[PDB]
């Protein structure tokens, strides 16, 4: 038994759900078992900074957030199934990284 | 740990703290009957939403309230006779386990030294240390005058209990004599209407002045 | 305070006038009817509309 682990990461949630949905359709169309997409913990990058450019005024601070969501999909070996993933249109924001595990 | 386990198991038949089941206690003052909570509960702590309730303070057990206003007893605008009563060495605030232990010890002291229900001794002290008149500066056209005013039972409870707590702090603060000993001594003095206690003394002071503001 | 917002007061009266019979005192029935008869995406304001149209339906049969 051999498996492929795919991690799909995006800031946009809807792009990620569309990519996952088309991967699911591909995996069920090729009839190869797929582990359901496990949504791994989303990374919240936080940066705070003082609003005022100079040093004047009340101590005012602004919070800036980046929520980036990533998901894990594991599939069983099938060269036909792996041929169709490189043709998947991937949006500019979604990054897909694929590794092969025994 | 043997006293610890035996005190764990003794209140298995529903007893406040470890001992001193509350059935035998009697409230003499009619004012505080519907406010002093005498429900039998093992541990005097509920972490309840009583502050957000207007009348949720009546539900809190008098011993839980006791620990509550014990933990807050440190530091104030009260420079009573020019003293700053702060707890600098492991203050009572937020360490409700240490306060829990100290009330346990003072209750044991009361039991031994008085040979009767410490809860009932506290009940008598609360009755005896609640003032019955305060003063308010009411004005008509910017001519203020001090007028005697009747105190609610709940405010009487609050002020008296704060007064005994502050008496305990005044006794223990800056002395070899421990906090548990101070609290036991203050509560026994207040139980028998002893003027030596801060609680009964300041009850008398609150009654007075308002005495002359008629 | 709990003053109901004016725009819901407007749309509630309008939906009252155009289907006087499609809304009854049952709260949940009215909630679904306003769910499907409008394009509201915020479920909360849908519940507000439902809560108010309940009161209007109640107002009806006494006068």
């Amino acid at each position: 038994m051999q498996k492929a682990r795919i991690k799909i990461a995006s800031t946009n949630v809807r792009s990620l759900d569309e990519v996952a949905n088309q991967i699911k359709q591909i995996a069920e169309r090729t009839g190869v078992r797929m582990s359901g997409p496990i949504p791994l913990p989303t990374k919240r990058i936080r940066i705070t900074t003082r609003k005022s450019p100079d040093g004047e005024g009340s101590a005012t601070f602004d919070r800036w957030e980046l929520r980036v969501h990533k998901r894990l999909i594991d599939i069983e070996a099938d060269e036909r199934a792996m041929r169709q993933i490189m043709r998947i249109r991937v949006p500019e924001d979604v990054t897909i990284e694929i590794e092969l595990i025994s | 740990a043997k006293p610890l386990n035996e005190r764990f198991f003794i209140p298995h038949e529903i007893k406040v703290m470890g001992r001193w089941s509350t059935e035998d206690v009697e409230v003499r003052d009619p004012s505080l009957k519907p406010y002093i909570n005498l429900e039998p509960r093992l541990l005097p702590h509920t972490h309840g939403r009583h502050a957000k309730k207007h009348f949720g303070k009546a539900n809190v057990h008098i011993v839980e309230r006791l620990i509550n206003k014990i933990m807050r007893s440190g530091g104030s605008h009260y420079k009573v006779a020019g003293h700053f009563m702060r707890r600098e060495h492991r203050s009572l605030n937020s360490k409700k386990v240490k306060a829990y232990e100290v009330v346990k010890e003072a209750f044991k002291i009361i039991e031994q030294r008085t040979g009767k229900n410490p809860i009932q001794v506290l009940v008598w002290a609360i009755e005896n240390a609640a003032p019955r008149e305060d003063t308010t500066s009411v004005m008509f056209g910017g001519i203020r005058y001090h007028v005697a005013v009747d105190i609610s039972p709940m405010r009487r409870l609050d002020v008296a209990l704060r007064n005994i707590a502050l008496g305990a702090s005044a006794k223990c603060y800056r002395n070899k004599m421990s906090f548990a000993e101070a609290l036991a001594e203050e509560i026994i003095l207040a139980a028998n209407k002893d003027p030596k206690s801060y609680a009964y003394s300041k009850k008398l002071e609150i009654e007075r002045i308002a005495e002359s503001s008629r | 305070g709990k003053i109901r917002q004016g725009f819901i007061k407007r749309v509630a009266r309008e939906l009252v006038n155009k289907y006087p019979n499609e809304f009854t005192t049952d709260f949940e029935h009215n909630k679904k009817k306003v769910q499907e008869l409008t394009n509201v995406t915020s479920k909360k304001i849908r519940n507000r509309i439902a809560g108010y149209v309940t009161k209007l339906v109640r107002m009806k049969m006494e006068g």
Partner: protein
């Protein structure tokens, strides 16, 4: 029975006094003049302080399994007074616990699993659970509820 059924303090005391017998455990020459950690500000009051550490360390191996120098430093660390600055938490010493672990290893109660730390041997487990059964029985006829 197991260590889980008794207080840790009493079990540490019992293991310390019992390991006082074994010639393996012996304080080094620099020990009495060196406190337990950097964060500590006064020397240990008593002279059995070495044995207790072993009675602690072995007990930790009964629970945390493979444990090396650094994690035992992490557990033992405590709060220190820095002067006018706020008190801050620091770690304990390392050579002391390293020598204690070496003495236990030469005693055969603990072995080394490289890359993970040091684990407890079967003999150490048997000794510890015999101690635990004895102490549990003691607090049983003291406190009958422990027969449950």
């Amino acid at each position: 029975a197991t260590v889980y059924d008794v207080p840790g303090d009493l079990l540490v005391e019992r293991v310390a006094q019992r390991l006082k017998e074994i010639p393996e455990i012996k304080p080094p020459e620099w020990a009495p003049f060196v406190k337990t950690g950097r964060h500590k500000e006064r020397l240990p009051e008593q002279e059995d302080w070495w044995y207790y550490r072993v009675a602690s360390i072995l007990r930790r191996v009964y629970l945390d399994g493979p444990v090396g120098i650094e994690r035992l430093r992490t557990y033992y660390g405590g709060r220190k007074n820095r002067g006018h600055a706020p008190e801050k938490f620091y770690k304990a010493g390392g050579s002391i616990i390293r020598k204690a672990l070496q003495q236990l290893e030469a005693a055969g109660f603990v072995e080394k699993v490289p890359g993970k730390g040091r684990v407890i041997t079967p003999k150490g487990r048997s000794f510890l659970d015999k101690i635990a059964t004895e102490l549990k029985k003691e607090l049983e006829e003291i406190i009958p509820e422990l027969k449950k």
